[PDB]
Design a binder for this molecule. Structure first.
Ligand code: F43
Ligand code: F43
Ligand code: TP7
Lengths: 568, 247, 432, 568, 48
């Protein structure tokens, strides 16, 4: 697309040909092959200057050494110009350091919003009440329950005398809404508690969700961020169940602790629970609701772009961005390692419009070659074959490589081979998935991209990068026990994927792409799709990339801060 | 035939505990069927028992030598819901203590699900079986209507100082002294009744002291009951030793 | 070297003068066979795979992959499937592989040959080879193109290997995955009570017996039956699980009409006195008699027997599973009060029952009795003497539960309940 | 002790005879058995009033129901007077609600300080350098290494060009110190980095510690609170290792990534790592450094009271307090459940001096009856026997019970049976451990207390309280595989202990008591003892109970806030 | 002595069952504990 290409060139112009801080990069040509290295060091960058000053001040105050760029071997950072990033699809121009998750409240809040969320069916609980107690469940009793629940969930008492409670000002982000595939029920629940499927989704998307879940009713529970940050992911479903239990006791005048209550527990904690992700094996031991457990389809469903956009590529790209940030910066870059971590490995996939350029080129290529296959639809899709993948993936990768070659700015932007590989393979995979409506065909294209990349440049990514790459093509359509899996159900714990940056976000985009090409309401789980179709949540799941930008410019307010109970 | 000895101890606390366990309890008051149903709060007084499953005679039962040997209760036969009666008992010499209420249930009633907590004791059973158990607890010396209360929720009070009128605190005020008698005008989960249930006069502090299954240093001191302390020590020594080597 | 007579669930003598050491999971051919058969067997829901294939609903709760429907008539072709599956599962023609079509083609029993168990570290080969065989059969029989292979595969395997288990899959045995073990040697303890009651067709004594076999095999594997602890555990297994000398059944019978936890205590204590297992050590000033055991492991076995007989009586009376948690607690609590002797497992049955009561009547976890097992955090603590009672309780329920045997265990019941050594475990152990 | 008994009385006076908020509780007797219930509801209390107002305003602003005390069944909280708590051993009078961990920054920071900490040996890494690269390690090279590490550990670059870094002002709580049993080496390392064993401990304790660890050198690593809160405990050792690795590369001019580097990784991640706790099984799945994995011995060693006190009882009581808070309020009451949780289950063991009274009485009883056995010493200790335990535990419990009976205020304070059980058993157990120097004798005492309690009152704790109790006595001296364990090595994952409130903190106290009676330098791990002998840590580990008080009155400043990068 | 039984036991078993394994104990085979398995049928693959 000409418009995306123009945006890409503008991003290169801004990054490399207008001065940032005092980097002296005013003027020049985004196609030129040369650069003047001024050896300014870190001070050329406004953020680094602030950091240096804080570091020295804190060191002196606390009495033990701290941040000191002169501790870098040989020379301090910024012997070449330190340049900004534009958040893709936006005019937000960010300090590099402001995109580190530690430094970015929007990124932290995105994870918190996922971590602190679970989904619990209501039907089993209602059946328990009817069967064991002979209670009648009506819209009225549900409304009373939901009001009770909205008091109880943030951490407040409904039954016992002399209870202490969480401070409401600390847990303001906690609430429960319900959603239902039963249109009649939906109309009779107090609107304050309802995620209205018919209002939030197109008529065709609503119809798919309703057909998938039938006439079932579900709670979308978001526990306090402050709690989530004190504890862990595995807390979430436990917290939800406790307060669901108390709310049932209170709202339905049960015995405050009888046999029927245990059925409610079991339902809430197991039989009718939907977690964001499942537990992880011993080497990387973690309970549910951690990033490792979050399947690529689950992430695709959390992200809300599919709901508000008719552009298949855009939907996929938002998922890529959200995925690269979560999976690489927070998951791999912190949970699974730490330190400086992997900001730029991820930013490559959501900044400067480079990925978008490659992807939009592909959409045009596909539409020209395959009779409008990349357009939203189900009849227009092409059957996944090796031939189709070879065609689309090769062409995508050649085009991406050539762009890096014609624009030394782009190559210097994506200075790591890994970054370029993620970008090239993400566009290839997304393109193959868009064309075929087959997520694994997307995976094939991803892997093929890597193979083309490697032969073209005589290099690929970092030392370890292509473990999953080389196992990649062969495991796409394997049906062996620990090899076979649709990409929609794959995730960070899929064996080949368990370790390495620059992939997991791409695979999420590929999962989404197979479905957004088709205009599907969801990628793998309608329950998650509806759960997050809720503007009350702190993080805007419909525009993840933009949200990262808002965080970079310190305009995002997270939940969970403790200033109320802190010295001023 | 083996005759149970129930519990050690020669003090009044001993005699009371043995009375509670054996069900050899003095009837002190009456409660009508309908009044009892009312306070229990599980169905309208006088109404049929709702069911959770069809009667045994209607649905049939799997081939089981145990089902064949063990007679279902009337409540089990009819497929009644499992419902409950729950009580709080003051530590200030309420006749009942939680464990002894549970022992009373387990020893004297068929098909019961007793549970003991510090602040509450419950019996879950098939509705009609449960009622017979609630009736006994309610009419006998086991319950004092001032120092105890039937409470299905918000049970707080057992450990709280008494009101000046000798009534144990109820957050939800389900029962209180009116005209020298205890009136219960709400169900056990504090839904107001269309009736005032007369539970009769409370025990004097003196009488409760003589009837209580609780030890207290200002009444019948546990410290002084060498026989029950010996019981504890014996069980303790056995459990410890046998967990090392059962021999 | 104790000898016991073994009696069935109707009080009929099965075997006289059985040395208890012959009842050891490590010695008894029938128990070993039960264990081997449990390890090597899995159920497959052909109906489930067929549904997942057509709808895309695979991989876990809520999951559905749109636009990837495969319409394969698995149920209508179950015999041919079973035959192909057998060919893949077997190691050698004529080995002990068995594959049976269950419930009109909806389900399969797959018994992997024992060679796979011999060659394996554990039992998961039955699942993995079973799933692999079914996956291969489907792909071949229905002509799945390679670009659809992932969809066919996950219809069987669910979310594995993103998940550690076959979440939202259609292959499972009576055991769980090794990694769910809380402890070392715990795999045979990780069997839902509902499963046990399903497999024994709600026969309460048989439920308790099958459960005792797994539990004690567990204890043995945990190294909890070494030296003096061997006699200890086998006495319990015999007296509680295998109706030794007909005592459990006799006690039930005499308490069946009007008996309570209280009267069952009287039955146990009466016998212990008669049989010389206990004597009065001292009479207290009040006339209360403090007992001592003449044989500590034997006293423990009487308490174990009593705990079960009490379960049969109390849960039996109420036709209500939930009564089991209080039965275990109060049988043992009141027994100690009655005698001044330790209750079963020296407080550990009562211990389990305290937490089990709470976790079967509260907000915090657990559930109805049917969800518990010897590997469960709540009910693991006793050395095999609690969970058999729970399986009995679940068997006896006449329909109070939300989490019925069917809801959790229908497939397992249909498939494993057909196997006679499982359905009739006392007869199995007694060689009948 | 007369001073403790008097201090208990004063706590009862403050709580019940002096007015608090508007509760009208002026005047009266602490020994009287009656109370007037004014049915004032929540408004009588100043915190509740503030919570009510915040709840109403937030509900209105966000447009979904929230905190509302009128949702409590029957009647709102405070039908009887709402009365305060005094932190034991202090004059800090706290609002009940201010001791909820959510509402209390000191409690959150205590957990943060532990979660974010690990200990990594240096010897193995030095051997690697010497063997594989033929490098000489000297005090000078270590000093340079530690300066590098203190730059890198918070999340700063030492090797690559164009790196983004954590903002120093967000991660000012992160640092690395060393300690060593090699006195000569200690004298040669720059003092800014050293935990000085000879300065921080008494001569006797320093000698025990040095004899234990020999001439080994260890890094005490505390990663950023902000990171710990974003991720989990399993992050900690990974983060440590990453930056240790980078620092070695930089400080010793290694190849930036060679085979020898992997050896450093293995040593830091595994061979020379000491975690606060280990991983947990599937049902409660969690990685290392979570509360469940934290042995009672470990907690005893983190708490620093043993280092600054010579009163065995005081030392044990501090551990009880820290333990009930962490294990019950955060771990059991949040991680393993959630909602309103278990504040007062825990406060019972660190407020109002009730536990202290019973314990100090016990010390006097022991000293009188066992020839000063409870005084600090080793050869004054009595051999653990059933007789000794029966004597001490029975006496302890009888006295504690009589106190509750003679002071209706105390009974009403510890209104829950479980609370009283913890108190009585803690005193009994600590008492038994103090006399014998045998922690498992402490456990026997704990269980016997429960046994006496139950028979005395015909009640014990909550429905599920005495699962471990009834298994308790028999498992104390079992040597069966999953039964036998010294209390020092026991923890929240010991099977009987894995579920229920009101125990774990007591068991920590008992473990400490066995050692504090002896004047021992540590309970189970000298590495943890020295690691936390460090005043730079935000949380004052020497005085956990007081610290909780400081948090209650909003005087504790936590790490990890994000106000720098949040809208103002 | 039974009061020292815990010490003798853990000399052998280490921190089990606080830990999932015999951490700091003195009994080991070639294999690892089952729960260390990444996948199904992996125990025999878990040999250093
Ligand atoms: C020491 C290693 C070996 C290793 O295991 N990890 C390193 C270490 C470094 C450290 C660097 C922090 C620091 O500078 O102190 C961290 C940040 C991980 C951490 N500990 O936080 C890291 N790499 Ni690496 N590392 C990166 C990259 C790279 C690229 C850089 C090539 C180039 O031309 O600059 C190459 C791999 C390759 O050749 O493909 C690379 C190498 C290597 N990577 C070499 C150092 C290379 C050198 O001597 O300069 N990283 C990248 O390719 C992109 C971004 C990136 C990182 C963080 C971010 O995403 O912002 C990151 C992240
Ligand atoms: C619904 C239950 C059943 C169950 O599984 N847990 C409950 C639930 C309640 C809920 C109460 C919140 C609310 O009121 O909405 C919570 C806070 C757990 C949560 N969901 O966060 C809880 N108990 Ni409970 N719960 C407690 C206690 C108790 C004591 C209270 C007895 C009394 O006389 O007041 C008794 C058990 C016993 O008798 O020993 C008890 C019972 C029971 N406990 C009864 C309610 C009893 C009633 O109807 O009043 N709790 C306590 O003993 C002390 C403190 C305490 C809790 C929180 C804190 O520690 O601050 C707490 C904590
Ligand atoms: C029993 C078990 O729950 P499940 O039976 O697995 O649902 C377990 N919970 C607990 O043990 C809760 C402990 C804290 C709350 C009660 C403390 S008294 C857990 O969540 O893993």
């Amino acid at each position: 697309a000409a418009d995306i290409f123009a945006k890409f060139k503008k991003s290169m112009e801004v990054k490399f040909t207008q001065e940032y801080g005092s980097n002296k990069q005013a003027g020049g040509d985004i196609t030129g092959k040369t650069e003047k290295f001024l050896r300014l060091g870190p001070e050329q960058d406004a953020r680094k200057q602030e950091m240096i000053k804080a570091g020295k001040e804190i060191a002196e105050k606390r009495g033990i050494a701290f941040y000191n760029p002169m501790m870098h071997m040989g020379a301090p950072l910024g012997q070449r110009a330190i340049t900004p990033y534009t958040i893709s699809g936006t005019d937000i121009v960010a300090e590099p350091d402001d995109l580190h998750y530690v430094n970015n409240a929007a990124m932290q809040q995105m994870w918190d919003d996922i971590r602190r969320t679970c989904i619990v069916g209501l039907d089993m609980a209602h059946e328990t009440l009817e069967k064991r107690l002979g209670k009648e469940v009506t819209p009225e009793t549900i409304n009373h329950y939901l009001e009770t629940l909205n008091h109880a969930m943030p951490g407040a008492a409904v039954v016992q005398e002399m209870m202490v409670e969480t401070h409401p000002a600390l847990v303001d982000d906690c609430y429960v809404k319900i959603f239902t595939g039963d249109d009649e029920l939906a109309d009779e629940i107090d609107k304050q508690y309802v995620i209205n499927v018919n209002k939030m989704f197109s008529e065709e998307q609503a119809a798919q969700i309703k057909a998938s879940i039938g006439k079932t009713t579900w709670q979308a529970i978001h526990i306090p961020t402050i709690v989530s940050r004190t504890t862990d992911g595995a807390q979430t479903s436990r917290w939800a169940a406790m307060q669901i239990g108390m709310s049932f006791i209170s709202a339905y005048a049960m015995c405050a602790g009888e046999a029927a209550v245990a059925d409610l527990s079991f339902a809430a904690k197991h039989a009718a629970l939907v977690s964001m992700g499942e537990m992880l094996p011993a080497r990387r031991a973690r309970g549910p609701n951690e990033p490792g457990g979050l399947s690529f389809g689950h992430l695709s469903d959390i992200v809300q772009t599919s709901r508000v956009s008719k552009d298949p590529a855009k939907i996929a790209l938002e998922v890529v961005g959200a995925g690269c940030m979560l999976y690489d910066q927070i998951w791999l870059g912190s949970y699974m390692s730490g330190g400086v971590g992997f900001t730029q490995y991820a930013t490559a996939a959501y900044t400067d419009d480079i990925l978008d350029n490659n992807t939009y080129y592909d959409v045009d290529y596909i539409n020209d070659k395959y009779n409008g296959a990349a357009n939203l639809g189900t009849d227009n899709k092409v059957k996944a074959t090796l031939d189709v993948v070879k065609d689309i993936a090769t062409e995508s990768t050649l085009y991406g490589i050539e762009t890096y070659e014609k624009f030394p700015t782009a190559l210097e932007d994506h200075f790591g081979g890994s970054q370029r590989a993620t970008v090239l393979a993400a566009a290839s995979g997304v393109a193959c998935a868009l064309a075929t409506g087959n997520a694994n065909a997307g995976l094939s294209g991803w892997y093929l991209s890597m193979y083309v990349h490697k032969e073209a440049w005589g290099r690929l990514g970092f030392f370890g990068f292509d473990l999953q790459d080389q196992c990649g093509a062969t495991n796409v359509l394997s049906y062996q026990g620990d090899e076979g899996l649709p990409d929609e159900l794959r995730g960070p714990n899929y064996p080949n994927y368990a370790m390495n940056v620059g992939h997991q976000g791409g695979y999420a985009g590929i999962a989404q792409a197979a479905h957004s090409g088709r205009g599907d309401a969801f990628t793998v789980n309608p329950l998650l799709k509806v759960c997050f179709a809720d503007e009350l949540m702190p993080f805007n799941f419909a525009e993840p990339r933009r949200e990262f930008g808002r965080g970079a410019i310190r305009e995002f307010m997270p939940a969970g801060e403790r200033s109320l109970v802190i010295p001023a | 035939a083996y005759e149970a000895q129930y519990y050690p101890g020669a003090t009044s606390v001993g005699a009371n505990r043995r009375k509670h366990m054996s069900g050899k309890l003095e009837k002190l008051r009456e409660i009508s069927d309908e009044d009892l149903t009312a306070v229990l709060g599980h169905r309208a007084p006088g109404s049929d028992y709702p069911s959770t499953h069809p009667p045994l005679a209607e649905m049939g039962e799997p081939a089981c030598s145990i089902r064949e040997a063990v007679a279902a209760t009337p409540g089990a036969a009819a497929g009644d819901r499992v419902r409950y009666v729950q009580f709080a008992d003051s530590m200030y010499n309420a006749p009942a203590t939680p464990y002894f209420r549970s022992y009373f249930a387990a020893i004297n009633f068929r098909g019961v699900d007793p549970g003991t907590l510090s602040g509450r004791q419950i019996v879950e059973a098939r509705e009609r079986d449960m009622e017979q158990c609630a009736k006994v607890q309610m009419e006998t010396e086991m319950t004092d209507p001032a120092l105890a209360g039937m409470r299905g929720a918000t049970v707080h009070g057992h450990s709280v100082r008494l009101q000046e009128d000798g009534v144990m605190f109820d957050m939800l005020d389900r029962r209180r002294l009116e005209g020298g008698v205890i009136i219960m005008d709400k169900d056990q989960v504090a839904i107001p009744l269309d009736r005032k249930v007369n539970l009769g006069k409370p025990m004097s502090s003196e009488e409760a002291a003589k009837r209580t299954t609780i030890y207290r240093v200002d009444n019948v001191a546990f410290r002084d009951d060498a026989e029950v302390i010996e019981w504890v020590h014996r069980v303790f020594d056995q459990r410890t030793s046998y967990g090392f080597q059962p021999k | 070297s104790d000898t016991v007579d073994i009696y069935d669930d109707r009080g009929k003598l099965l075997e006289s003068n059985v040395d208890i050491m012959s009842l050891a999971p490590t010695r008894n051919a029938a128990i070993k066979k039960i264990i081997l058969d449990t390890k090597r067997s899995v159920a497959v829901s052909l109906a489930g795979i067929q549904g997942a294939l057509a709808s895309g609903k695979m991989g876990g709760k809520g999951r559905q992959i749109l636009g990837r429907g495969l319409n394969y008539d698995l149920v209508g072709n179950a015999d041919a499937i079973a035959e192909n599956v057998k060919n893949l599962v077997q190691v050698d023609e004529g080995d002990d592989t068995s594959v049976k079509v269950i419930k009109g083609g909806k389900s399969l029993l797959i018994q992997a040959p024992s060679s796979r168990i011999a060659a394996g570290a554990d039992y998961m080969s039955a699942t993995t080879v079973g799933a692999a065989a079914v996956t291969q059969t489907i792909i071949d029989m229905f002509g799945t193109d390679m670009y659809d292979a992932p969809i066919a595969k996950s219809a069987v395997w669910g979310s594995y290997p993103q998940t550690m288990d076959l979440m939202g899959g259609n292959v499972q045995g009576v055991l769980s995955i090794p990694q769910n073990n809380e402890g070392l040697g715990f795999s045979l303890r990780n069997i839902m009570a509902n499963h046990i009651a399903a497999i024994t067709s709600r026969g309460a004594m048989n439920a308790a017996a099958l459960s005792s076999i797994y539990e004690q095999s567990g204890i043995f594997e945990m190294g909890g039956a070494v030296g003096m602890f061997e006699r200890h555990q086998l006495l319990g297994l015999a007296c509680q699980g295998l109706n030794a000398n007909n005592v459990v059944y006799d006690i039930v019978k005499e308490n069946g009409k009007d008996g309570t936890i209280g009267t069952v205590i009287e039955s146990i204590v009466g016998r212990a006195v008669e049989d010389g297992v206990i004597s009065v050590d001292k009479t207290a000033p009040s006339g209360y008699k403090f007992y001592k055991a003449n044989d500590v492991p034997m006293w423990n076995a009487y308490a174990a027997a009593g705990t079960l007989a009490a379960t049969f009586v109390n849960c039996g009376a109420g036709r209500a599973a939930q009564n089991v948690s209080s039965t275990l607690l109060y049988f043992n609590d009141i027994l100690e009060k009655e005698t001044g002797l330790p209750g079963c497992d020296y407080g550990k049955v009562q211990g389990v029952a305290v937490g089990f009561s709470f976790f079967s009547h509260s907000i915090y976890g657990g559930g109805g009795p049917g969800v518990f097992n010897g590997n469960h955090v709540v009910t693991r603590h006793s050395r095999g003497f609690a969970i058999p009672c729970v399986c009995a309780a679940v068997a006896l329920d006449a329909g109070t539960q939300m989490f019925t045997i069917e809801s959790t265990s229908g497939l397992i019941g249909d498939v494993f309940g057909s196997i006679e050594e499982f359905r009739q475990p006392i007869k199995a152990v007694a060689g009948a």
